[PDB]
Design a protein around this nucleic acid. Sequence first.
RNA 1: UAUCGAGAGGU
Lengths: 51, 61, 113, 45, 66, 48
Amino acid sequence: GHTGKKLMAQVFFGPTYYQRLRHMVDDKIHARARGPVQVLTRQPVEGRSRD
Amino acid sequence: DPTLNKTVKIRQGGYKGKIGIVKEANGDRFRVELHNPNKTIPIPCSFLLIESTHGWVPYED
Amino acid sequence: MNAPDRFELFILPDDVPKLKITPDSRVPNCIIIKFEREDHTLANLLREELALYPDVTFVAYKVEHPLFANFVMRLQTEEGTRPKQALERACASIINKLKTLDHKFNEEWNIKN
Amino acid sequence: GVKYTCGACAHNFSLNKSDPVRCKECGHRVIYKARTKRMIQFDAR
Amino acid sequence: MIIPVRCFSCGKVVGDKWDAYLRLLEEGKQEGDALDELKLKRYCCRRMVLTHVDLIEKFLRYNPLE
Amino acid sequence: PPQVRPSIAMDETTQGQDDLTHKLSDILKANINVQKLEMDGSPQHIIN
RNA sequence: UAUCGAGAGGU
Ligand SMILES: Nc1ncnc2c1ncn2[C@@H]1O[C@H](COP(=O)(O)CP(=O)(O)OP(=O)(O)O)[C@@H](O)[C@H]1O
Ligand SMILES: [Zn+2]
Ligand SMILES: [Zn+2]
């Protein structure tokens, strides 16, 4: 596509049935600087959903 | 500040014509929560129209 | 969530130049041109045109990362010619070839009506 | 005060929070909030 | 859900051909020939109409909620 | 101290005690009943 | 911005 030149190799090409799986990156991405701690250990809490 | 949480229209920039809400207006640089995609953008307060009693009024509301 | 605005591919920020020329002093008479908000479309077009000039000794370009709409070109000309000038000529040369091409299409189009 | 809609008979009505939660028309106790006064915009992309 | 407006792969409009495609099938044409008559030449475009499932007909059976 | 055995609030206004707090309560109750026997109604097989 | 568990999953 960049040059319009043919590819030296031919490409296996055609329809195939593909699935959209439940795993999406913006449901997983997570970062923590500081945030909440456990009352008993004062160590950071567990889980994306709790910071 | 008197324009937080009030509905806004953008009149300049790449987001021109889009609806939003003033999420945070600390000073000069506001944070408008766009309606159309799920993102809150930085925008100068000069770029906004606020809704009031009669139509969309610039930052004289 | 971290997706940039699609208009950033072609709208130039006001503090960002469409074009920036610096020298490559490692060899004589060579410039590096950084093009902002441009594609293979412009770069490959200029590149071939330039490479066929007899007084162009080196021309290449690369898009360093497909997620950012810029590219960088390297252009060296022989002692006689000044590199930036050869680039100006390639622009006007290609504009002319496209003017001709637009004319011949217009004519051929009426002929096919 | 606030517009609702009956989940069974689709009657539209209002309630002043203190009213019991049912439809005046059929007495159904499952109701749904009517849409916002606010304008909605989408980017058509 | 409802016929897509464009072919995903090339962009050709196919959202104006759904009724014509169903009509050709009532008239007894085979699916391949019906697609041929509709001028759907690239197989990306043929896939769009041949494999679409009209679910909006199912969703409409649910008595409107206003 | 309570730092070792903190209380938790299930629904804002409802708080339960740590397992250790309850277990020390059990030791304290059981301790009082040893004092209540050897000084009055002790049927021996009950003191044990 | 709870605690204890359980179940289903990701590499
Ligand atoms: N149950 C588990 N416990 C621990 N580590 C695990 C694991 N399941 C997966 N992993 C990690 O993930 C790797 C598995 O990689 P996969 O993607 O599952 C297979 P592969 O051998 O890399 O490729 P293949 O699919 O070509 O055979 C393990 O080697 C380990 O690094
Ligand atoms: Zn009702
Ligand atoms: Zn197609």
